[PDB]
Design a protein around this ligand. Structure first.
Ligand code: 0WD
Ligand code: CA
Length: 358
């Protein structure tokens, strides 16, 4: 049993994808504690239109005011399971909606979406069915774990710079003012919880959300949300073309899933300064590669993802939170499956399983 990943198998019409609704949200504070409210949400606050072009120093505060998340901690789905536990009765969609849903993080779905074009990084997804519901939780691959432990100084600082850019672009209160003098603490996160459906696969997933734009004409989430990105300044048309083809595909996939309609990008020069901003509407990103022989195709992304969901659903027949079907994929190969029980792959915690059982 395996699943091919070549884009030519998936090039048909765009599949059904339900307009996403936000079911709720949660926050993680500076100590990585869960709170079932929006306390971590920040508000889009771009530089005044009448003032100077941005000149954000993305290195300011590195590493002295940097409080990085401890990446050795395996959170898996735990934060999302807690939200689900705390909202299990008052869920949308009617009786047994959760039982026919697939539950995962937005970022796991993003990786599925980009799989047909991905040439470098493989993945592993653990799958457990429990009370009908299919749960998907990423497993760090061996190469990804070594690459992580040996992360160049450069990539460590780039990651800080992405977060620092958000600090320059966001305020703690609507219409408030940004505060770059503060600490960059990546334990802090605001997460949106959404309902969608791909083909006939109902979806419940959560994703980190950078800010809410109080100037957006539609105030209903997720339409009022904005995604913040940084990227190298580009000069030649070849450089923009490469950007469109590789980077935009990932930006698209990440923001398309939860219905986040705009990505705001800060382009940074080699000295670490953002000295321009560009807005990319999620629904127009594909326009940049529509008639490009080397471009990507949203239909391919979504049809492969729908096909992977059908594959997972039909492969994972046993209802058992301690059993795991591990889906493995490396560039140039098909998705394959192995089966495992209990430690280390089993990822549904007892505090979830026991409460859901009662
Ligand atoms: N393989 C894993 O263990 C994963 C854990 N997660 C966790 O689950 C929750 C949902 O995250 P997501 O599904 O929104 O994740 P993704 O879309 O992959 O990333 C969105 C943002 O989440 C942040 N983020 C996500 N993962 C990490 C990380 N490992 N270390 C530090 N920051 C992280 C980051 O701001 C990133 O923004 P950029 O795409 O601009 O880098 C978060 O609390 C996240 O920590 C997510 C994906 C994969
Ligand atoms: Ca971001």
């Amino acid at each position: 049993p395996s699943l091919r990943t070549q884009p030519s198998l998936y090039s048909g019409p765009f599949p059904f994808y339900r307009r996403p609704s936000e079911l709720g949200c949660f926050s993680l504070d500076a100590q990585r504690q869960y709170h079932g409210d929006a306390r971590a949400l920040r508000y889009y606050s771009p530089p005044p239109i009448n003032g100077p072009g941005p000149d954000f120093d993305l290195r300011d505060g590195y590493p002295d005011r940097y409080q990085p998340r401890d990446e050795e901690v395996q959170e898996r789905l735990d934060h999302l399971l807690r939200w689900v536990l705390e909202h299990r009765n008052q869920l949308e969609g009617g009786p047994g909606w959760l039982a026919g849903a697939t539950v995962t993080w937005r970022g796991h779905l993003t990786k599925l979406l980009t799989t047909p074009y991905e040439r470098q990084e493989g993945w592993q997804l653990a799958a457990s069915r429990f009370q009908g519901t299919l749960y998907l939780s990423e497993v760090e691959t061996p190469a990804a774990r070594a690459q992580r432990l040996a992360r160049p100084p450069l990539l460590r600082e780039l990651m800080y710079m992405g977060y620092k850019f958000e600090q320059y672009m966001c305020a703690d209160k609507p219409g408030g003012s940004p505060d770059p003098s503060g600490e960059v603490n990546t334990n802090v996160a605001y997460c949106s919880v959404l309902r969608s459906r791909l083909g006939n696969h109902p979806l419940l997933f959560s994703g980190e959300v950078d800010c809410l734009n109080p100037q957006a004409p539609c105030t209903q989430p997720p339409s009022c949300y904005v995604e913040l990105k940084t990227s190298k300044e580009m000069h030649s048309p070849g450089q923009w073309r490469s950007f469109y083809r590789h980077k935009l595909l990932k930006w698209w996939a990440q923001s398309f899933l939860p219905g986040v309609p705009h990505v705001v990008a800060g382009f940074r020069n080699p000295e670490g300064f953002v000295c321009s901003l560009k807005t990319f509407p999620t629904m127009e990103m594909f326009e940049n590669v529509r008639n490009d022989r080397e471009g990507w195709n949203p239909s391919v992304c979504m049809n492969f993802c729908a096909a992977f969901l059908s594959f997972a659903q039909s492969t994972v027949v046993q209802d058992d939170p301690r059993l795991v079907h591990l889906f493995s994929w490396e560039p140039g190969g098909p998705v394959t499956v192995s089966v495992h029980r209990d430690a280390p792959y089993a990822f549904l915690p007892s505090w979830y399983v026991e409460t859901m059982t009662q």
